[PDB]
């Protein structure tokens, strides 16, 4: 057991294989080839021992081998490990099994100091078994009848404390000002001061009462995360009986099993699904530990959910090259390879619909000229206090955001540089909007 | 008065701004044709504004490269239906989406 | 917006509040008072911003305050952040809600360079609303009639390749050899080369036949993990109708929602649960980032399960003081405050039965006497290649471990020191069993 | 042939009994089944048409003229909203039936849950404009009988009057199961 | 509407395309690629007519194209028309859909006199969505514990006429005999 | 008139199914009720050969909203009559 049968420099991966990239840092002085083979062994099979039973199976077919060795540019002790795995190791249409198989054990092995999974080449045979998005981007736009602009969203503040009536009072004001989404926060599942059976029914009246007064279709994410799938599906059915168009779920804190369970429920019931990436900074934040959010983005797009947070936009998560690296994977059908944006594999989705890219985290009125030039129109903007922070109330603030973005896009199609003439497009729009005239004065500049 | 915001009914998009000038229509349609989309015209009475499908006028102008023709058929529908909206839509053929949907005339 | 309102050194924590302990290191130059208050704010409210809706709520009730600041011994830039959270911001009986409220947002906060969660004081009021373990330790011991000795186990190898009949044949060898548990690998959910409906029915034949031959009751943790919650229950009931006593489920990747849903399913159906902690090294391995495994152990004991992986025993995780810390939280009824073992708070579980502490990671015969003294009798040992590495097959290996265990136990009750007298206890048991004689020779020393 | 060799109400039984084996026999070079005289006692047990000509005319309030229909084109490519857009225009022009092509059962570019939903308004919007009842066959051909019943029931909940089915390739068993389902739910 | 748009002698089959083999002969005098294009057009799109609705769709992606023409051995008017189909045209995990899309309409055409479907190349993506055999040879042998020899069966005779108990009487004799 | 009767001979004939008669009679009952300004009903014959087929017709009649039904007790059996009799009390028909 000294490996190097997991290190095959001649193999060419099959088109049905699932490749991976591990930015691995090894022990001092050890040959770089040995550690990649060890990584391949502990993540696929964890063998050879000295066992009679290990001869009943021709293990040469099932063993995942490392086929290419590369070094991370600008650093010496680390390297890039490319490994090939057969398709037979994973259950069809299951995302929980692949995460457990790949990153489930190789992290715990003591011969590695820092390990990081970067990208996966999902084969079409595995993609076609996964459910994918329930609606997609184009079907969401067609159902909601909104074309040619990024959508609007807000987060209700305060998160904790408002009862059923006050919550409906607050959401009703934001909806009637120009917005079309309000987000039930992750903190709100079922509190003693405000039960879900009371929040669900009274947010239904506020959405329907302001919908007819504006003439547009509006929605409100209802937090349906629960401690048990039996209770969670109950909230889903109660939301259906009220006729709400869109719901919300926490996939990292709820498990991919429950996330897929909700994904297969919405498609049979024709609803739009929103996803919040809670706890994501535990695994993603540091550059040598954990799993890149891009891997989680691919796994989420395969699992389901029509809208996923990208964040964090204060002023931006950064780098822009990296964020667009996995934004294209959330929206396109085929994403070419690019090291500048970190696309290690030629990722093809075929005919799988895309997922909206949601930007949030405290956007104010002067961020609009830079927010649209990067995310495009297939995006959703969700403010924390941008709507509520208007001195005239939370209803007039919504018109200040709606007017600002519409001038922004209408300047974008005209061939102007929105990111460059921010003041020239914001001020001239304020000449036809008194609410924007004060909103631009408040959060200066 | 300030500060009291009255609920206003806009249709879908570009509602919160005053009506577009003639030149604004010009570069908007220039962009929509430059993207390679297909211009399309719709029109309804303001009562049936919420309806899923509007009325064509007349057919999607597939493969039109001249800017002097569409800017002549936008007013024909308005004069024929002086109490109707004039919606201008962009048909995305490859992805089966609609990249532009803004109403030109509010309706006399 | 200047904070310092949350940092109240005069507040007295209530017996019903939820406490916490954070190891933090802020930006260069900032006072410890400000950064601790910011940590408390981003985990409780994320307020006060400029919002007009924030005056409709009595905010002082739902605010999380810091009442104590301690300095980390051996470090200068670090300190301990003790915070008390009111009981009214958490749903009764949900484990996914408390962690979402805790680690959902504060980890993305920019003003903190290092963050680690170490201790939580769960009040008895929230403990009483949680489902808890299905059976526990004493109920499992009563049901399976195993007293006075730790239980044994094995991991079936090879991980990939065995068919339905060969899997049961390998299982039958180990069960008849002396062991009383076998573990399905975490990769096995439902493979193309081995469907789960064939593995369930074939392993049901090996268990029953070896059950009567030896005269003992045996169990086999069946991997009931699935892509959807509906498929999980179907496998659970299919295993139930086959008469299997114990099942296996993966909690991190299956999600707390699904784990609790299966946890409340087992109590009515009389099934015992085995828990596998996959990819855990992402979070608990690094001492500056992530969550301590102690928090996960408490959350599991609150959520359910009767046995849990602790690992890793190669040759030990090290140090032993920390391992005995959360193990005391996994088994005991009352836990005092001890800084040496990391017991930062007085945690009382009331009358909830404990959970078995299962060691793993390639234990062999010579490690066995030292694994008995530290873990006690409420422990389970699992060997992956240790059992199957015996030259005389797969049943002779189990006999060697079973003989060695019982001699070690009987020498412990005789007042001898098992860990210091491993030799004088081990070679004397080899004269009554030739299988142990060769097992001791092949694995030296 | 005696009547005892055939099952009551099972059209599949007479096929496998009569044509199942005779063609494979070696002593025949050219064979062709032309006509079969079905006895009345065997006819009576068969469910027959769920509505028939007279009931269809009575329910649709169309008399004295052969009905009109159209097939939606192109067969492949139309999204959910485009299908409804092209269905509505044909119905509002005078026709009373629009057909789903056999290729459209459930395609990746146009799911059946969206085809059913976006057809529901085109029929319902062109019906009120002309004052005539209009229909649109929704293809319920499925790989499993559980799915075909699901599609048929979803069509029923939408209030659609008529559906479509492929019996030669979809199986006489499935067609008969759907045929009896249509009678109890008042479907064409 | 003169075809040869479906006749792509340069197309390269993908790993997701479902290929087919057709042995065909058409009306006398037609060029060989013309009849191949005709076979290709109807089974995929049956187009182009003069329709405004046929321009709403990028119909160059969904077209099924015949890429290879080979001569049938022993015949002069016969040939092999290999045709490629994009995977987007078939429902995932359905065996009825492929037959309906393939031969549900092409056989009814007038310009083809003799058409024979010979082989189908199923792509792995479509294969992985289908249910397939429930147990298989290996699982059946494992459950029946019959190894290394072919299995033996028989058909009960007479087929028509036996009562309820006589059927069991006849079946028991065959089973107990070997 | 306020009631019209379905005679006992009419249960389910090939020239007139029980599903077709129920739905077209339902339109006439409601269409005449609004014109006359008085509540009008029409007895529907729910006699069948199997007890569950009686219940299917009864529930189909309820879904169409007819208030009154008919049953033949001598030729239908006191068992079936009592089965429908207690069914009407929990459904509130005549
Ligand atoms: O490395 C070893 O020493 C073994 O392979 C045994 O070798 P032998 O067969 O030579 O004894 C260990 O069992 C595994 O590493 C982990 O054990 P498990 O998979 O059981 O958790
Ligand atoms: Mg938030
Ligand atoms: Mg393992």
Q: Which of E137, E141, E143, E145 to mutate to test the interface with C (most CBs of C within 10 A)?
A: E143
Contact check, Cβ <8 Å, D85/B51: no
Between residues 3 and 42 of chain D, which touch chain F (CB distance below 8 Å)? none
* Ligand 1 touching residue C385 (CB < 6 A): yes
Active site residues of A: 157, 276
CA distance A128 to A118: 22
Residues whose CB is less than 8 angstroms from the CB of residue A28 and which lie 6 or more positions away in sequence, other chains included: none
| E97 appears as a binding residue in the annotation | no
Angle in degrees, 0-180, between the axes of helices C434-442 and C422-430, rounded to the nearest 10: 130
Which candidate from D5, D74, D107 shows the least CB-CB separation from E53?
D74
Distance CA(D24)–CA(D22), nearest Å, equals: 6
CA of C66 to the centre of ligand 1 (A): 47
Domain boundaries, chain B: 1-108
State whether the beta carbon of A53 lies less than 6 angstroms from ligand 1.
Answer: no
Nearest ligand to residue A47 Cα = 1
Question: What is the DSSP annotation of E13-25?
Answer: --SS-EEEEEEEE
* Residue A286 CA to ligand 2 centre (angstroms): 21
Among the partner residues A50, A189, A260, nearest to C227 by beta-carbon distance: A260
Sorted by sequence, the CB contacts under 8 Å of residue B2 that are 6+ apart come out as: A392, A434
Nearest CA to ligand 1 atom 7: C385
Could you tell me if D106 lies within 8 Å of chain A, comparing CB atoms?
no
Sign of CA dihedral A204, A209, A210, A213: positive
**Closest residue (by CA) to atom 14 of ligand 1?**
C362
Cα E1 to Cα E7: distance, rounded to the nearest angstrom: 13
Which residues lie across from A425 on neighbouring strands?
none
3-state SS, chain A, equals CCCCCCECCCCCCCCCCCEEEEEEEECCCCCHHHHHHHHHHHHHCCCCCCCCHHHCCCCCCCCCEEEEEECCCCCCCEEEEEEECCHHHCCCCCCHHHHHHHCCCHHHCCCEEECCEEEEECCHHHHCCCCCCCCCHHHHHHHHCCCCCCEEEEECCCCCCCCHHHHHHHHHHHHCCCCCCEECCCCCCCECCECHHHHHHHHHHHHHHHHHHHCCCCCCECECCCCCHHHHHHHHHHHHHHCCCEEEEEHHHHHHHHHHHHHHHHHHHCCEEEEECCCHHHHHCCCCCCECHHHHHHHHHHHCCCEEECCCCCCCCCCHHHHHHHHHHHHCCEECCECCCCECCCEECCCCCCCEEEECCCCCHHHHHHHHHHHCCCEEEEECCCCCCCCCCHHHHHHHHHHHHHHHHHHHHCCCCCCCCHHHHHHHHHCCCHHHHHHHHHCCC
C89 to A191, C17, C63, C131, C290: CA distances (angstroms): 6, 10, 10, 19, 23
Q: By the 8 A CB rule, do D166 and E97 touch?
A: no
The residue written with tokens 């030896």 in the block is: C214
Q: Which ligand ends up closest to the CA of A309?
A: 2
Cα–Cα nearest to A142, from B15, D113, B98: B98
CB-CB: which of D183, D184, D186 is closest to F23?
D186
Question: Which residue, among A260, A246, A317, has the nearest Cα to A91 in the 3D structure?
Answer: A260
Judged by its nearest atom, the ligand closest to the C-alpha of residue A43 is: 3
Q: To probe the interface with C, which of A91, A105, A159, A183 has the most C CB atoms within 10 Å?
A: A91
Answer whether D109 sits within 8 Å of A351, measured CB to CB. Answer: yes
Residue whose token pair is 């936008």: B74
φ, ψ (nearest 5 deg) of residue A235:
-65, -35
Q: Are strands B38-43 and B86-92 parallel, antiparallel or unpaired?
A: antiparallel
Q: Is A241 exposed, middle or buried (0-12, 13-18, 19+ CB in 10 A)?
A: exposed
Resolution (A): 3.8
Which secondary structure element, helix H or strand E, spans residue F82, and what is its range?
A: helix F78-91
Test D58 with F24 for CB contact under 8 angstroms. Answer: yes
Please tell me the distance from the alpha carbon of residue D73 to that of residue D87, in angstroms, as a whole number: 10
Touching subunits of A (3+ CB pairs, under 8 Å) are: B, C, D, E
Does an interface of 3+ CB pairs under 8 Å exist between A and E? Answer: yes
CA A76/CA D164 separation, integer angstroms: 67
Cα(C442) to centroid(ligand 1), Å: 13
Q: Are C178 and C386 a contacting pair, CB within 8 Å?
A: no
User: How buried is residue A395: exposed, middle or buried, by Cβ count under 10 Å (0-12/13-18/19+)?
Assistant: buried
Torsion of CA A409, A410, A413, A415, to 10 degrees: -110
Query: Which positions in chain A touch B17 (Cβ < 8 Å)?
Result: 403, 406-407, 410, 429, 432
Pick from B5, B8, B101: CB nearest A148 = B101
Token pair, residue D61, equals 């309030």
CA–CA distances in Å: residue A335 to residues A293, A350, C178, C262: 17, 11, 55, 39
What's the rounded Cα separation, in Å, for the pair F6 and F46? 10
Do chains B and A touch, with touching meaning 3 or more CB–CB pairs less than 8 Å apart? yes
Beta-carbon contacts below 8 Å between C and E: 9
Question: CA dihedral in degrees (C392, C397, C398, C402; nearest 10)?
Answer: 120
A254 and C96 within 8 Å at the Cβ level: the answer is yes
Q: Which residues of D touch A142 (CB under 8 A)?
A: 79-81, 118
Query: Can you tell me the distance from the alpha carbon of E146 to that of E149, in angstroms, rounded to the nearest whole number?
Result: 7
How far is residue D1's CA from residue D12's CA, in Å, rounded to a whole number? 16
CB contact under 8 A, E57 and B60: no
Cα distance between residue A152 and residue A402, in whole Å: 8
Contact partners, residue C363, CB within 8 Å, separation at least 6: C313, C371, C381, C382, C383, C386
Contacts of C200 in chain E (CB under 8 A): none
CB C256 near ligand 1, within 6 Å = no
The C-alpha atoms of residue C31 and residue C26 are separated, in whole angstroms, by 8
Protein residue with least CA distance to atom 6, ligand 1: C385
Residue nearest to atom 2 of ligand 1 (CA): C362
| Residue D62 a catalytic site member | no
Q: Show the domains of chain C with their CATH numbers.
A: 18-129 (3.30.70.150), 137-442 (3.20.20.110)
D84 and B56 within 8 Å at the Cβ level: the answer is no
Instruction: Give A 382-441 residues with CB within 8 A of chain E.
Output: none
> Technique behind this structure?
cryo-EM
Ligand 1 and C389: CB distance under 6 A: yes
As a whole number of angstroms, the distance between CA C221 and CA D48 comes to 55
* Separation CA A390–CA A394 (nearest Å): 6
Cα–ligand 2 centroid distance for A295 (angstroms): 22
State whether B99 and A377 contact (CB < 8 Å).
yes
CB contact under 8 A, D89 and B52: no
E contact test, residue of D7, D75, D76, D106 with most E CBs within 10 A: D76
Contact B93 E56 (CB under 8 A): yes
Instruction: Please name which ligand lies nearest the alpha carbon of C360.
Output: 1
Alpha carbons C214 and C219: distance in angstroms, whole number: 13
- Residue D139 pairs in a beta bridge with D164
Instruction: Find, in chain B, the residue whose alpha carbon is nearest to that of E57.
Output: B93
Which residue owns the Cα nearest ligand 1 atom 19? C384
* Residue C361 CA to ligand 1 centre (angstroms): 7
Burial-class residue A399 by CB neighbours within 10 Å (0-12, 13-18, 19+): buried
Are the Cβ atoms of A88 and C191 closer than 8 angstroms? yes
Binding residues of F for Mg(2+): 5, 7-8
CA-CA distance, A46 to E174, in Å (whole number)?
Answer: 51
What phi, psi does C37 have (nearest 5°)? -65, -40
C-alpha distances (whole Å) from A212 to each of A39, A182, C71 are 59, 17, 59
Q: Which residues is A343 bridged to in the sheet?
A: A338
> Phi, psi at residue A200, to the nearest 5°?
-65, -45
* Distance in Å, CA A108 to ligand 3 centroid: 10
**Cβ atoms of A351 and E88 closer than 8 Å:** yes
Please report the atom of ligand 1 found closest to the CA of residue C385: 13
D82 contacts B53 by C-beta, under 8 angstroms = no
Q: What is the DSSP string of C20-57?
A: EEEEEEESTT--HHHHHHHHHHHHHT----S-GGGGSS
Residue C153 CB less than 6 A away from ligand 1: no
Catalytic annotation, pick one of D26, D44, D62, D73: D73
Q: How big is the D-F interface in CB pairs under 8 Å? A: 9
């Amino acid at each position: 057991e000294y490996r190097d049968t997991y290190w095959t420099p001649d193999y060419v991966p099959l088109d049905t294989d699932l490749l991976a990239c591990f930015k691995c840092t090894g022990q001092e002085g050890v040959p770089k080839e040995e550690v990649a083979a060890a990584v391949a062994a502990e993540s696929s099979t964890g063998t050879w021992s000295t066992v009679w039973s290990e001869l009943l199976v021709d293990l040469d077919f099932y063993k995942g081998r490392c086929y290419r060795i590369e070094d991370v540019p600008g650093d010496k002790e680390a390297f890039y490990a490319f490994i090939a795995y057969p398709l037979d190791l994973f259950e069809e249409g299951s995302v929980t099994n692949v995460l457990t198989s790949l990153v489930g054990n190789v992290f715990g092995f003591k011969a590695l100091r820092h390990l990081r999974l970067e990208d996966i080449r999902f084969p079409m045979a595995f993609i076609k078994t996964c459910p994918g998005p329930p609606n997609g981007i184009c079907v969401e736009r067609d159902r909601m009848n909104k074309y040619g602009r990024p959508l609007l969203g807000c987060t209700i503040k305060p998160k904790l404390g408002l009862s059923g009536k006050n919550y409906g009072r607050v959401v009703y004001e934001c909806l009637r000002g120009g917005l079309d989404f309000t987000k039930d926060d992750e903190n709100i599942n079922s509190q003693p001061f405000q039960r879900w059976q009371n929040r669900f029914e009274f947010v239904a009246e506020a959405v329907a009462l302001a919908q007819q007064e504006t003439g547009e279709k509006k929605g409100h994410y209802l937090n349906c995360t629960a401690a048990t799938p039996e209770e969670m599906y109950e909230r889903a059915e109660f939301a259906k009986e009220l006729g709400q168009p869109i719901i919300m779920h926490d996939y990292i804190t709820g498990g991919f099993t429950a996330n897929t369970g909700l994904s297969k429920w919405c498609r049979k019931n024709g609803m739009l699904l929103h996803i919040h990436r809670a706890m994501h900074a535990v695994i993603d934040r540091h550059p040598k530990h954990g799993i890149h959010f891009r891997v989680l983005a691919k796994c989420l797009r395969l699992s389901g959910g029509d809208q996923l947070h990208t964040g964090t936009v204060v002023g931006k998560l950064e780098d822009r090259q990296t964020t667009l690296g996995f934004i294209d994977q959330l929206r396109e059908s085929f994403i070419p390879e690019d090291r500048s944006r970190g696309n290690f594999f030629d990722q093809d989705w075929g005919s799988m619909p895309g997922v909206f890219a949601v930007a949030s985290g405290g956007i104010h009125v002067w961020h609009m000229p830079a927010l649209v030039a990067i995310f495009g129109d297939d995006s959703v903007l969700q403010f924390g206090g941008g709507t509520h922070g208007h001195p005239w109330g939370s209803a007039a603030g919504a018109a200040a955001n709606r007017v600002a973005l519409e001038a922004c896009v209408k300047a974008r199609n005209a061939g102007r540089e929105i990111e460059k003439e921010s003041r020239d497009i914001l001020m001239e729009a304020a000449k036809h909007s008194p609410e924007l005239a004060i909103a631009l004065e408040t959060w200066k500049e | 008065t300030v500060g009291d915001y009255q609920t206003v009914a806009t249709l879908e998009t570009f509602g919160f701004l005053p009506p577009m000038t003639q030149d604004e229509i010009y570069d908007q349609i220039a962009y929509i044709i430059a993207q390679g989309w297909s211009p399309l015209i719709e029109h309804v009475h303001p009562s049936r504004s919420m309806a899923t499908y509007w009325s064509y006028w007349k057919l999607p102008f597939f493969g039109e490269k001249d800017l002097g023709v569409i800017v002549s058929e936008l007013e024909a529908c308005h004069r024929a239906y002086p109490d109707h909206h004039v919606r201008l839509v962009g048909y995305d053929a490859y992805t089966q989406s609609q990249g532009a949907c803004f109403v030109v005339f509010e309706g006399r």
